[PDB]
Design a protein around this motif. Structure first.
Motif, PDB file in Angstrom:
ATOM      1  N   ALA A  33     -27.721  47.088  22.044  1.00 39.41           N
ATOM      2  CA  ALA A  33     -26.706  47.630  21.152  1.00 39.41           C
ATOM      3  C   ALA A  33     -25.288  47.416  21.711  1.00 39.41           C
ATOM      4  O   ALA A  33     -24.414  46.937  20.996  1.00 39.41           O
ATOM      5  CB  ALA A  33     -27.015  49.105  20.898  1.00 39.41           C
ATOM      6  N   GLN A  34     -25.063  47.663  23.005  1.00 43.07           N
ATOM      7  CA  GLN A  34     -23.787  47.368  23.668  1.00 43.07           C
ATOM      8  C   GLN A  34     -23.432  45.885  23.589  1.00 43.07           C
ATOM      9  O   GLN A  34     -22.293  45.544  23.270  1.00 43.07           O
ATOM     10  CB  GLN A  34     -23.835  47.780  25.144  1.00 43.07           C
ATOM     11  CG  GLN A  34     -23.704  49.294  25.351  1.00 43.07           C
ATOM     12  CD  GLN A  34     -23.766  49.698  26.824  1.00 43.07           C
ATOM     13  OE1 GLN A  34     -24.018  48.908  27.725  1.00 43.07           O
ATOM     14  NE2 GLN A  34     -23.531  50.951  27.135  1.00 43.07           N
ATOM     15  N   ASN A  57     -22.662  45.001  19.793  1.00 42.89           N
ATOM     16  CA  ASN A  57     -21.389  45.592  19.393  1.00 42.89           C
ATOM     17  C   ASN A  57     -20.210  44.944  20.120  1.00 42.89           C
ATOM     18  O   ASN A  57     -19.147  44.792  19.530  1.00 42.89           O
ATOM     19  CB  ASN A  57     -21.426  47.113  19.575  1.00 42.89           C
ATOM     20  CG  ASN A  57     -22.391  47.797  18.626  1.00 42.89           C
ATOM     21  OD1 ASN A  57     -22.926  47.213  17.695  1.00 42.89           O
ATOM     22  ND2 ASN A  57     -22.615  49.075  18.808  1.00 42.89           N
ATOM     23  N   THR A  58     -20.383  44.469  21.351  1.00 43.26           N
ATOM     24  CA  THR A  58     -19.349  43.675  22.026  1.00 43.26           C
ATOM     25  C   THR A  58     -19.163  42.330  21.335  1.00 43.26           C
ATOM     26  O   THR A  58     -18.039  41.934  21.049  1.00 43.26           O
ATOM     27  CB  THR A  58     -19.678  43.469  23.503  1.00 43.26           C
ATOM     28  OG1 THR A  58     -19.783  44.717  24.154  1.00 43.26           O
ATOM     29  CG2 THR A  58     -18.588  42.681  24.223  1.00 43.26           C
ATOM     30  N   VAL A 102     -19.777  41.611  18.179  1.00 44.48           N
ATOM     31  CA  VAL A 102     -19.095  41.909  16.916  1.00 44.48           C
ATOM     32  C   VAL A 102     -17.628  42.214  17.150  1.00 44.48           C
ATOM     33  O   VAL A 102     -16.774  41.592  16.532  1.00 44.48           O
ATOM     34  CB  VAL A 102     -19.775  43.064  16.178  1.00 44.48           C
ATOM     35  CG1 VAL A 102     -18.965  43.531  14.971  1.00 44.48           C
ATOM     36  CG2 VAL A 102     -21.140  42.624  15.663  1.00 44.48           C
ATOM     37  N   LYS A 103     -17.292  43.126  18.065  1.00 43.84           N
ATOM     38  CA  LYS A 103     -15.895  43.511  18.310  1.00 43.84           C
ATOM     39  C   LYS A 103     -15.049  42.336  18.772  1.00 43.84           C
ATOM     40  O   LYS A 103     -13.891  42.258  18.385  1.00 43.84           O
ATOM     41  CB  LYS A 103     -15.822  44.666  19.311  1.00 43.84           C
ATOM     42  CG  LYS A 103     -16.299  45.966  18.651  1.00 43.84           C
ATOM     43  CD  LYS A 103     -16.494  47.076  19.686  1.00 43.84           C
ATOM     44  CE  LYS A 103     -17.189  48.270  19.022  1.00 43.84           C
ATOM     45  NZ  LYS A 103     -17.477  49.348  20.003  1.00 43.84           N
TER      46      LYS A 103
END
Lengths: 49, 48, 50
Positions: A14-15, A18-19, A21-22
């Protein structure tokens, strides 16, 4: 708290996602992080840079 | 390619430029290979 | 204006045919930054300052 390893394996993914994506929000020295801004604002000769 | 043109329009004779001559007189490719040569031929071309 | 006391005009609540501006070759140069003068006719702006 017993399932620390299995919950960690999900959290690490998940980290990472999400990294990933960000990082789409990052400019990298471009005019915008949003690709449609560049393509609406610029001629191809400038937009390619 | 060769022609006469107004001196202030000479800018337009480069790839991807904007302006009337480069739009609808003589248009260069976006990825042009070659050389562009010009001179102020007022001693030969003028008359009015 | 003198540059000393340079003049700002805010432009607002209106339609701007920038193609007419860019085609007026009495303008000796027309450099643009963050936008290409072609695309001005396709965009819309929250304010404009001249």
């Amino acid at each position: 708290s017993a399932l620390g390893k299995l919950q960690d394996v999900v959290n690490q993914n998940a980290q990472a996602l999400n990294t990933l994506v960000k990082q789409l929000s990052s400019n990298f020295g471009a005019i915008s992080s949003v690709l449609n801004d560049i393509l609406s604002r610029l001629d191809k000769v400038e937009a390619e840079v | 390619d060769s022609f006469v043109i107004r001196g202030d329009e000479v800018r337009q004779i480069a790839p991807g430029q904007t302006g009337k001559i480069a739009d609808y007189n003589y248009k260069l490719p976006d990825d042009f290979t070659g050389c562009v040569i010009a001179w102020n031929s007022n001693n030969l071309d003028s008359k009015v | 204006a003198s540059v000393y006391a340079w003049n700002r005009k805010r432009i607002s609540n209106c339609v701007a045919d920038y193609s007419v501006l860019y085609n007026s070759a009495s303008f000796s140069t027309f450099k643009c930054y963050g936008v290409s003068p072609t695309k001005l006719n396709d965009l819309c702006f929250t304010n404009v300052y001249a």
